[PDB]
Design a protein around this ligand. Structure first.
Ligand SMILES: [Mg+2]
Ligand SMILES: [Mg+2]
Ligand SMILES: [Mg+2]
Ligand SMILES: [Mg+2]
Ligand SMILES: [Mg+2]
Ligand SMILES: [Mg+2]
Ligand SMILES: [Mg+2]
Ligand SMILES: [Mg+2]
Ligand SMILES: [Zn+2]
Lengths: 141, 100, 75, 144, 185, 142, 62
RNA sequence: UGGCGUUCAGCCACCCGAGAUUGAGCAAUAACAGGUCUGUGAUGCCCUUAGAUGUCCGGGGCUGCACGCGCGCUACACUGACUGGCUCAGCGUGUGCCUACCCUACGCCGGCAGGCGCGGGUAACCCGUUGAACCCCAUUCGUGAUGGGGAUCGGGGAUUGCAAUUAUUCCCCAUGAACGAGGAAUUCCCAGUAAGUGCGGGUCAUAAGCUUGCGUUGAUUAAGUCCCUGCCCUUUGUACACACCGCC
């Protein structure tokens, strides 16, 4: 019996990234190159497609827990600011880089916000999100 | 026939004596009752200085106040309860009564 | 104290010593080779990525801070 | 291919400024006064160039382009929220200030603030404290 | 598998204690071996309950020092773990024999004190606590402001203490500790 | 119709690891996911000393489901080792003989007492006029 | 000057100006006659083994 | 249970067991010329009392700076900074008397600071199962102050308010400065303890480099002494008794 939960959830996004690259209907926005992703990071992303990774991480936080992740996506993707005075508080994520993403993942059909807020997923996309996991499982020993 | 009677107070033993009074007279008058459900207690914290002035080694007092809360649900009519919430009530105790 | 002027890329012959003698060391790590060859620590990682698929170094561990390459096969 | 090809300089005379020829290009530009770490990766991004190369593997007819981008960072779509000269007082245009202009306009702006006998700026003539700090203990880097 | 105990792919036996003085106060054997060098602690509430902690655990607990290391034991196990790999592939021996040799060759036998000073000898537990503190400090200074991992420092310092090549703050502070108490003994 | 539900708890600091034991195959899973993708991967064999000390035949016939609440990253490991140890002994207690329990208890105890005895240690408060629980502030004269 | 070993048979006290050293009656394991009183640093329990660089001088019992 | 001791009070060791010293609160007779009239509509005497030392409205200062000391913060880097990913907390508060000032989910507009609409909650009922931090796995990286370090002092955007100039706080201009592990001297400290590390409250329209609490990562050494600085009893000596800061 195979699912996402026996796959050592680190390269599951290193093949779900390449699958949302290869299919390539994600509506990358216009301003991709020139953002900080936070108010605590200091540089741009090193990887040239930093948008697909975050779409795969979101698509698994969404597979795992919840139909109510909107600002809890910024509560899960913040970090550590550095004010030059004292260790700073866990700073929030970015509102636009995730509102634009979930509106861009509404372009295909895997997400569906219904009630009690937030975006939840569909069994039809759960088919795809579950079949490549047994692929990685048998292909990694 | 859905009536909840909340007993909240500071005095633990006298609040226990009223919640067991208000259950033993229900049980001795034949109406089904739930248990004496105990909610967790809340505390207060005040930390001040033990000095009017600023002189002396820096020493601080402290102050607390605990509070408890119980609630009891019944299955009864809503007229004899004015008598029931009157038999040996004790000072300090703040009884709430909800019929809705 | 001395200053260190290392090399970014091989001039002509320090590569001609690396392809002659590095594959005959028992301890091939980038902080040992760089003490021998006078090279920067951002180059030894590219040299042992070449000899990985060139197949002469017998990779052992791969922790991000330290790699361990032994000798080759006995014979 | 880990050996030195031709054309591999060690000092790139760029903009009356000597650029090292061994650092990564994302940290080779910062010798220009004004442009630092963030704006460099963008200039080395709007042209589809690798930034995992050394200063000397990039051709001489190709660094006329990253340079033209850094001189004119408008026609190549850089937004209005990067420029360290937004809404100038004298003309009122948006642009970038490079290695010369960043000291030039800076010491013409402090002369402008100085001439009017203004307390914000009549403190550089004294050489003392303004951004709103107290002193009482915090200089003492000499000072008689 | 009756009781084989990898220390991350090593073996507990084939360990030979040379001296008679350090016989029971050094526990690196059958009963005193665990697949990993970590425990819940509680080994200092009594006085001589420390002499039953394995020397692997006491190296781990005494590796982390100076501020930016207080509270990282799960991290400092990994240095030891790569350190025995490097020793196995540079000397080609059992490194738990190498380490017991380095403790022996690194322990002092006397020390000077104040009664102008006069000299006495040392206890075996003193000799363990001293040889460990010594060679661990000498590995750290040689890895401070140096392109060398602390594992490769501990590897060569354990080698030049089971070799005596005068490349060791561990042996080097032994002569200064002995010759001072020798002039005045 | 077997209802052999063996619910065992275990504590470290604030690590309320609850094991569970049914009858069936021999497999272990925690929060659903198996033992591999558990936390620090430097701490792998701390789930195998309940296996490797005894053996892998001792876990034939018992299947395991594990709840976890509270605690940090390490205490959620030292509470999920003691839990399934106390659930093995408590399964041989209630459903099979009490006598073959004593060898398993002896072998687990002759390795470490933590397998069966919780740690009666927690953190400690902060008195007034100090930056900690014992350390006082910098006192300066003159 | 050969290097010898000895054996504790009796602890005596804590001597020094600070109370930082011990005082222990040790025998010798080669010659069961020799037995001297010395002073030893560190934690010492009875019935244990010591080592002597010199084995001629002797402590001052007090 | 053994060991030790007048076979008295007790000490060490051991088994059995979740524990064989957990942590604070309260606290003596007698006394000090300790501090507070700037907490009080607790108060004696003295000055002023209508050109007011009472009271209100406009400003500006208490934040100034050749030097000196005391409490603290970030640091001086590879056990290390930078991008991803991964996965775990416990104490709390929260819509007001005069009182206008709550914690906030969830939908959109924007780089970001935020805004515009919308709903819940007087609270184990919602915010929230409070996806808290280094630590964890894959990424780039100096012997020179380097991507370490990020300060006096330089261009632009939003919020609280009747008002921010001497810049109220946070993102977007920079100088990218001193600092290569610290002298004589000196503080604190023995087990979930030192240290690292983030959260809550208090103060609060605006608000944490202080403080009061909580958690999490978790050590090295010691089971001893009177040498130093001090205290406690018995004996001793005295020309001191406002008492060695003495008297002469
Ligand atoms: Mg900083
Ligand atoms: Mg966080
Ligand atoms: Mg070190
Ligand atoms: Mg008086
Ligand atoms: Mg008065
Ligand atoms: Mg000072
Ligand atoms: Mg510096
Ligand atoms: Mg002292
Ligand atoms: Zn008053």
């Amino acid at each position: 019996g195979v699912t996402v939960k026996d796959v050592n959830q680190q390269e599951f996004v290193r093949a779900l990234a390449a699958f949302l690259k290869k299919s390539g209907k994600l509506k990358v926005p216009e301003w991709v190159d020139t953002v900080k992703l936070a108010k605590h990071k200091e540089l741009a992303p090193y990887d040239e497609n930093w948008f697909y990774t975050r779409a795969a991480s979101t698509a698994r936080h969404l597979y795992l827990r919840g139909g109510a992740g909107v600002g809890s996506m910024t509560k899960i993707y913040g970090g550590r600011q550095r004010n030059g005075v004292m260790p700073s508080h866990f700073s929030r994520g970015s509102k636009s880089v995730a509102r634009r993403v979930l509106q861009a993942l509404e372009g295909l059909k895997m997400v569906e916000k219904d009630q009690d807020g937030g975006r939840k997923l569909t069994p039809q996309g759960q088919r795809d999100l579950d079949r490549i996991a047994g692929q990685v499982a048998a292909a990694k020993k | 026939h859905r009536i909840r009677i909340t007993l909240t107070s500071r005095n633990v033993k006298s609040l226990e004596k009223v919640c067991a009074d208000l259950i033993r007279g229900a049980k001795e008058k034949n109406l089904k009752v739930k248990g004496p459900v105990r909610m967790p207690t809340k505390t207060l914290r005040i930390t001040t200085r033990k000095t009017p002035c600023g002189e002396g080694s820096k020493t601080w007092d402290r102050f607390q106040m605990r509070i408890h809360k119980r609630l009891i649900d019944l299955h009864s009519p809503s007229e004899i309860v004015k008598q029931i919430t009157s038999i040996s009530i004790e000072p300090g105790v703040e009884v709430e009564v909800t019929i809705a | 104290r001395d200053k260190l002027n290392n090399l970014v890329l091989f001039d002509k012959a320090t590569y001609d010593k690396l392809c002659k003698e590095v594959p005959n060391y028992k301890l091939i790590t980038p902080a040992v080779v760089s003490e021998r060859l006078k090279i920067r620590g951002s180059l030894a990682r590219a040299a042992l990525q070449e000899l990985l698929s060139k197949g002469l170094i017998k990779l052992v561990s791969k922790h991000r801070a330290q790699v361990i390459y032994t000798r080759n096969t006995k014979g | 291919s880990l050996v030195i090809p031709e054309k591999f300089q060690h000092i790139l005379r760029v903009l009356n400024t000597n650029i090292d020829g061994r650092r990564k290009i994302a940290f080779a530009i910062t010798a220009i006064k004004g442009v630092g770490r963030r704006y460099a990766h963008v200039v080395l991004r709007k042209a589809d160039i690798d930034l995992t190369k050394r200063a000397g593997e990039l051709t001489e007819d190709e660094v006329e382009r990253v340079i033209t981008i850094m001189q004119n960072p408008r026609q190549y779509k850089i937004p209005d929220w990067f420029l360290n000269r937004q809404k100038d007082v004298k003309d009122g245009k948006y642009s970038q200030v490079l290695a010369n202009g960043l000291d030039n306009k800076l010491r013409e702006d402090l002369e402008r603030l100085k001439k009017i006998r203004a307390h914000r700026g009549l403190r550089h003539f004294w050489g003392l404290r303004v951004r709103g700090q107290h002193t009482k203990t915090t200089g003492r880097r000499g000072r008689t | 598998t009756p009781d084989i105990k990898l220390f991350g792919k090593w073996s507990t036996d084939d360990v030979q204690i040379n001296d008679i003085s350090l016989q029971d106060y050094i526990a690196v054997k059958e009963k005193y071996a665990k697949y990993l060098p970590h425990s819940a602690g509680r080994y200092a509430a009594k006085r001589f309950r420390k002499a039953q902690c394995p020397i692997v655990e006491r190296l781990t607990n005494s590796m982390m020092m100076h501020g930016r290391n207080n509270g990282k034991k799960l991290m400092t196990v990994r240095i030891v773990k790569h350190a025995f790999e490097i020793i196995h592939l540079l000397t080609g021996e059992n490194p738990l024999q190498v380490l017991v040799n380095a403790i022996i060759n690194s322990g002092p036998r006397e020390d000077s004190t104040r009664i102008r000073r006069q000299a006495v000898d040392v206890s075996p537990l003193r000799r363990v606590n001293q040889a460990i503190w010594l060679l661990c400090t000498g590995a750290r200074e040689a890895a401070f402001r140096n392109i060398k991992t602390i594992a490769e420092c501990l590897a060569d310092e354990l080698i030049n203490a089971a070799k005596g090549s005068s490349n060791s703050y561990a042996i080097k502070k032994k002569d200064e500790l002995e010759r001072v108490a020798k002039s005045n003994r | 119709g077997p209802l052999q539900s063996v619910q065992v708890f275990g504590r470290k600091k604030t690590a309320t690891a609850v094991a569970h034991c049914k009858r069936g195959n021999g497999l272990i899973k925690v929060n659903g996911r198996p033992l591999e993708m558990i936390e620090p991967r430097t701490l792998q064999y701390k789930l195998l000393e309940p296996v490797l000390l005894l053996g892998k035949e001792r876990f034939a016939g018992v299947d395991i489901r594990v709840r976890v609440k509270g605690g940090g990253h390490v205490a959620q490991i030292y509470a999920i080792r003691q839990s399934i140890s106390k659930a093995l002994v408590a399964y041989y207690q209630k459903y099979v003989d009490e006598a073959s329990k004593k060898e398993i208890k002896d072998i687990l105890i002759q390795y470490d007492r933590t397998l069966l005895v919780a740690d009666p240690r927690r953190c400690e408060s902060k008195k007034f006029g100090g930056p900690g629980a014992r350390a006082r502030y910098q006192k300066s004269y003159r | 000057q050969p290097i010898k070993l000895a054996r504790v048979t009796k602890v005596l006290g804590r001597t020094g100006s600070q109370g930082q050293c011990t005082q222990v009656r040790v025998e010798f394991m080669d010659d069961t006659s020799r037995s001297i009183i010395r002073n030893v640093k560190g934690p010492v329990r009875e019935g244990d083994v010591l080592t002597l660089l010199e084995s001629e001088r002797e402590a001052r019992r007090l």
